[PDB]
Structure 1
C-alpha cells in the first residue's frame, strides 16, 4: 500500500509531521509519499493532489491552504476510491472523512485570553499569519478576536506572509515602525512567532512588546527561553502525521465505516462529523523545562 500526504510549507513544523508519517508507515508496512511546497502554494498542492490520484495511491491526507479550492479534486479522489482525510487545517465540505489536528478556534481563544492577561485588558496588537485562506489561520484569528472582545485591546493589523520567513520578518519589522506604540504581536503560524521575536529583539523591546504565538520548534523555544516570547500554543504535528497514515491504512484494511466507528465524533449543524483532536501544550518561560521533560517522556524528545 501507498499513502500520500500533502503539507503547506517547508517549515521544520512540517518535518515533525513527516517524521510521524514515516514512523507510522514503517510500523504498519506502508509506503509514504510526502510533499510540501516552499511557501503557501495552492496550485502546487492541487497538482500534487492530482498526481497522487493518477499514481493510484491508496490514501490521501491533505492540509489545504485553501479549503474550497481542493473540493473538486478531493471529490475525484473519493470517486476513484481513494480515502481522504485532512490534517493541520480543515476542508469540511470536501467529503474528507476525518479531520486530524488542533482545535484551531479554541487554540486561538486560549491564546487570546493569555494575551488579554499580559496586556492587562488594553493595548494595540498586530497579527502575523501565513495565510488568509487556510481555515486553520482564520479560526485561530477568529478565536483570538472573540477572546479579547470584552476588552480595550485593539488589533491594528493582520499581516500575511504566505508562509515565508524573510517576508514574515520584514512585515513585522515594518509594522513595528508604523506602530511605535505597539504593545504586542500575535503569531498565528510557526514562522510568525520567531519572526516577531527577532524583530522585537532587534529593536531592543524585549518585554515591552509582548509576543503570544504558535508552535514549539527550536527557534521559538529559544526565544521563550530568552524571555522574548511569553507564551506559545504548541501543537502535536508528529501525531497528526502518524495518525493520518494509521487512519488511512485502516480505511483500506477494514473499510471507511468500520474505521469511523472507532474515532471521536462531533456534531456540526445537527450532523455527525469525525475529529481527532491532537491537543495543544501551552508553553511559557515558566513551564518550558517541564515541557522538554513531558515531550521526551511521551516519545517525541527535544
Structure 2
C-alpha cells in the first residue's frame, strides 16, 4: 500500500493538530502515514528525517521547513527519485515542491478586518499589536486588515512593535490606553497579542468598551473569548493542513501529479504557474465559542483553557 511522510517543526500542540489531520486522512483513504517532529526547532533533525523518508522509499512527502532554503537541495533529490513533495504551514516557494498548503495571511488579515469593521460600525480608532515589522505573516495580516477597513471611517492610530516580547506587549498596550482615552479597539497579530491586549483592557476596567480582534485559538485566548473580553479571534486550521497534505499527495500517486494540480487553485508568480491551498480561518467569538469547542472535540482535538 502507500506510505506518506509528514515533517512538522517542533513538538507543540499546534503540530499535534497537524498530526491528527495527517492520521485522519490516512484512515479515510487507506494510506500509511509517518509524522515526525523533533522535540524543538531544528532544521538538521528535519533534514535528516527527510533523508530517511527518501532512503526508506516513501511515496509522498509533506514538510514544514524551519529553513525554507536549506531544504531545497534535499527536496530536489526526492523529486528525482520520483517522490512527490508538498509544503505545509511554512512555504519554500523555490524548492521544487508542487503545492503549498497553509494559512493565507493576507486573506486571514482581511477577514479580521471585516470583522473589526462590523464590530465598530464603520467608525472608530484602532491600535495594532504585533511582534515583528519585517516578517511576512505579520505584514500580510496587517496589509489585509488595512485593506478591509479602507472604505470606512475607521482609523489606525498606532502600530506597537514589542519585538517578540509579551512583557513589552503588555506595556505597549497600556501606553496606548494611556495615550488614547478614546481608543475603540485593539487588533493583535501574533498569538501573544490578543491575550496581552485583553489583560490590559480587563485591568483598565474597559471590557466591551474597547473591542479586541486577534489571532489564533490558544487556551489563554479561548479563555478571554469565554470571559467576553475578546470578541473575535482568527483560529487557524493546522488539522486541515496535514489532512490535505496527505490527500493531495495521495492523489499525485493515484491520478498522477499533473491531473492533481489541475484540480487545485491556480496562482501566477511572475509568469510562473503555482498552486496554493488556503486552509483559511475559523472566526471564533463569544457567541459561537461553544460550537467551535464541539467541532474541535469531534475532530478528536482536546481543548484546555
TM range, smaller chain: 0.7 to 0.9
The runs of 5 or more residues in structure 2 that have no matched partner are none
Q: Which moved more, 1:187-196 or 1:108-117?
A: 187-196
Cα deviation, 1:21-40, whole Å, max 9, x if unaligned, reads 22323455555444557787
Q: 1:221 to 1:70 in 2, by over 3 A?
A: same
What is the TM-score with the length of structure 1 in the denominator? 0.74
Q: Secondary structure at the match of 2:124?
A: strand
What is the TM-score with the length of structure 2 in the denominator? 0.73
The count of aligned residue pairs is 302
Q: Which moved more, 1:193-202 or 1:292-301?
A: 292-301
Q: 1:10 to 1:178 in 2, by over 3 A?
A: farther
Aligned-residue offset at 1:246: 2.2
Q: Which moved more, 1:241-250 or 1:166-175?
A: 166-175
Conserved? CA contact 2:105–2:137, under 8 Å = yes
Conserved? CA contact 1:88–1:136, under 8 Å = no
Cα deviation, 1:100-131, whole Å, max 9, x if unaligned, reads 23433222112112223434555554444566
Conserved? CA contact 2:107–2:144, under 8 Å = yes
Q: Which moved more, 1:219-228 or 1:152-161?
A: 152-161
- Give the Cα–Cα distance (whole angstroms) in 2 for the partners of residues 160 and 109 of structure 1: 20
Aligned-residue offset at 1:212: 0.8
Cα deviation, 1:139-193, whole Å, max 9, x if unaligned, reads 2222112223345655466567787877866776777678777543323344443
- Give the Cα–Cα distance (whole angstroms) in 2 for the partners of residues 66 and 42 of structure 1: 6
Aligned-residue offset at 1:96: 2.0
Q: Which residue pairs with 2:292 in the alignment?
A: 291
Q: 1:206 to 1:141 in 2, by over 3 A?
A: same
Q: 1:116 to 1:4 in 2, by over 3 A?
A: same
Aligned-residue offset at 1:292: 4.3
Supply the RMSD in Å over aligned alpha carbons: 4.2
Conserved? CA contact 2:17–2:301, under 8 Å = no
- Give the Cα–Cα distance (whole angstroms) in 2 for the partners of residues 235 and 288 of structure 1: 14
Aligned-residue offset at 1:237: 2.0
- Give the Cα–Cα distance (whole angstroms) in 2 for the partners of residues 125 and 38 of structure 1: 39
Q: Secondary structure at the match of 1:152?
A: coil
Aligned-residue offset at 1:244: 0.7
Conserved? CA contact 1:101–1:276, under 8 Å = yes
Aligned-residue offset at 1:11: 4.4
Q: 1:12 to 1:297 in 2, by over 3 A?
A: closer
